[PDB]
Amino acid sequence: KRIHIGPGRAFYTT
Amino acid sequence: HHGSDLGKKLLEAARAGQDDEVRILMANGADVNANDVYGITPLHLAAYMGHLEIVEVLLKYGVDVNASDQFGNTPLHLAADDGHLEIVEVLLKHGTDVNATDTWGSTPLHLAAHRGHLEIVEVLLKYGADVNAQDKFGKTAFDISIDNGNEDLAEILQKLN
């Protein structure tokens, strides 16, 4: 899966 | 920047990469700086997802290229993160703050360095990215490149120390 490198990325894929 | 029916539709159209819908919404008065409860705007979404044409439409309508969500993300962070070179280029040409920091202290240069996006690093440097900026963990873009073993990227940032 994607590896997030900054905050709040979960809220970009809802 | 909320409560407008067109603003919610614009956010959804940007998130879904629907170019024509973004265009028509803007042509009919939608708020170019609409945001959701997290502070995320159509430009943030288009920049993260790589919707270049949508980015260009929002720029044409005078969008705030420096808008930050509640996490401190700017569109330039997100385009540098997900590797969208042409979007990085157009944002910088429109005057985005090249050294904006998110809540982890990362500038767009830090994010491009984490990812190894060589061409994006070069454009950020051309527009004045600060090679000495440290994130909340004390790391520069060069430090990141060394930690990740990116010899190509370290080759460039080494020269600028």
Author numbering:
A (entry chain B): 5 to 18
B (entry chain A): 9 to 169
Give verbatim excerpts from the published study on this entry:
The V3 loop of the HIV-1 envelope (Env) protein elicits a vigorous, but largely non-neutralizing antibody response directed to the V3-crown, whereas rare broadly neutralizing antibodies (bnAbs) target the V3-base. Challenging this view, we present V3-crown directed broadly neutralizing Designed Ankyrin Repeat Proteins (bnDs) matching the breadth of V3-base bnAbs. While most bnAbs target prefusion Env, V3-crown bnDs bind open Env conformations triggered by CD4 engagement. BnDs achieve breadth by focusing on highly conserved residues that are accessible in two distinct V3 conformations, one of which resembles CCR5-bound V3.
Since 63_B7 also bound well to the linear peptide, it was additionally crystallized in complex with linear V3-crown peptide (MN). It should be noted that 63_B7 and bnD.2 were selected using different panning targets (V3-IY mimetic and CD4-bound gp120, respectively), thus highlighting again that a common transient conformation of the V3 must exist. Five shared resistance mutations highlighted the similarity between bnD.2 and 63_B7. These positions (T257, K282, P470, M475, W479) localize outside V3 near the interface of the gp120 inner and outer domains and involve residues of the CD4 binding site and/or layer 3, a structural element previously implicated in Env conformational transitions.
